[PDB]
């Protein structure tokens with residue numbers, strides 16, 4: 001079944017893989033650097049999972065006002081435990097990326113609103129981008145990088161996808177979780193339309209959606225927008 | 231690149247796998263039994279590959295008039311060698327499923343015209359079905375079974391597809407050959423319209439296209455028709 005949150009043994013298996021493969025986050029970190037991330041900024045991570053990105057970002061930028069938000073209570077627990085193990089005082093919240101509920105204090109205050117490998121799981125994609133832009137301060141940036149439906153791969157992308165599937169070993173049932181996340185992923189045009197719809201409500205000075213692979217190992221969609229000036 | 235014929239080392243690898251996995255042909259043979267295959271009949275196998283099906287059918291029906299046709303001269307060579315090795319007096323021809331050329335002596339004379347795991351590779355699917363119906367005698371049947379684009383899978387179909395990919399060992403580059411054949415495969419609507427187009431030129435008493443998995447291991451499209459009686 002297509003279910004948004006990752007919970008239970010799957011969430012634990014996800015963390016076991018993620019925490020031991022920090023290099024997989026390199027491409028996303030580079031995009032954040034490209035988007036203009038810097039120490040002291042307020043950054044909101046929607047669908048933060050088990051907090052791998054937060055630990056990475058806080059290490060490079062110790063004065064970041066960083067908050068991770070996830071729909072899974074198991075992921076929020078794990079993230080908090082993980083941050084504590086790493087010796088970091090990071091904030092994680094239970095919440096839905098498709099709603100402002102529980103994030104009203106951050107409304108219009110984020111320098112950077114980000115999401116990695118999650119937006120493909122959502123039921124209401126335009127609602128997620130709406131939340132992104134409303135959390136962003138005027139002049140703030142938003143950046144999603146997530147899975148594309150395999151119909152949008154060219155031959156090279158499809159080959160890379162098969163190669164990724166073939167990696168071994170997978171923890172527990174993480175292979176089919178990864179593969180089904182693609183089966184249920186939106187098309188490029190879905191991402192394009194979702195961001196456009198959100199930008200009509202919250203005006204942007206810039207927006208760009210594209211597909212490439214600059215490190216993760218398979219092509220992924222990137223969605224970037226800059227909220228308009230005040 | 232999307233290329234119709236399977237040649238060179240890939241053709242050899244295909245045969246090495248095929249000859250040690252006769253069980254994979256069970257679903258297709260059952261369809262032929264359901265279609266009314268019987269000893270002494272004239273049967274044309276379009277895109278016959280290295281002759282695995284021909285040897286299987288010949289063993290079961292020793293007086294079948296079997297002709298296998300393939301675009302790959304390597305497959306034709308291999309098929310003849312394999313037939314000889316297996317002690318079967320079979321005929322193989324170099325030819326194109328999308329044209330009647332080289333099969334003019336068989337026009338309107340086939341009790342059954344069949345093709346397995348090949349039509350997904352073709353450039354002109356309607357031309358292939360046109361050739362099928364023209365080879366069929368009045369009252370004769372045509373049956374294709376081939377790959378569908380993964381977009382047409384439901385979750386169970388997609389899980390089966392991943393499971394098939396996870397099978398070990400694969401010979402040489404056969405995994406990516408099999409996988410890319412799906413990447414480049416037609417949709418269900420493409421198969422349905424192609425057969426319909428052909429049926430408008432060569433009238434049929436019956437016509438049906440469907441997807442299921444009764445043994446091969448992944449869902450495949452079936453395309454069946456019976457040419458109108460004389």
Ligand SMILES: Nc1ncnc2c1ncn2[C@@H]1O[C@H](CSCC[C@H](N)C(=O)O)[C@@H](O)[C@H]1O
Pocket residue numbers: 004005006007018046047048049050052053069070071072075095096097098115116117118121122
């Ligand atoms: N509507 C929603 N709101 C918030 N989080 C969601 C969500 N739907 C799915 N998620 C979360 O998105 C995560 C996908 S896994 C990706 C985790 C993390 N961003 C990383 O890159 O490592 C899961 O933790 C899942 O619980």
Ligand SMILES: Nc1ncnc2c1ncn2[C@@H]1O[C@H](CSCC[C@H](N)C(=O)O)[C@@H](O)[C@H]1O
Pocket residue numbers: 234235236237248276277278279280282283299300301302305325326327328345346347348351352
């Ligand atoms: N236009 C065409 N005409 C005839 N054969 C073709 C063709 N395009 C591809 N082929 C052949 O289709 C085969 C696909 S492999 C499947 C082989 C066989 N039917 C089996 O079930 O085992 C290859 O041998 C390839 O050479």
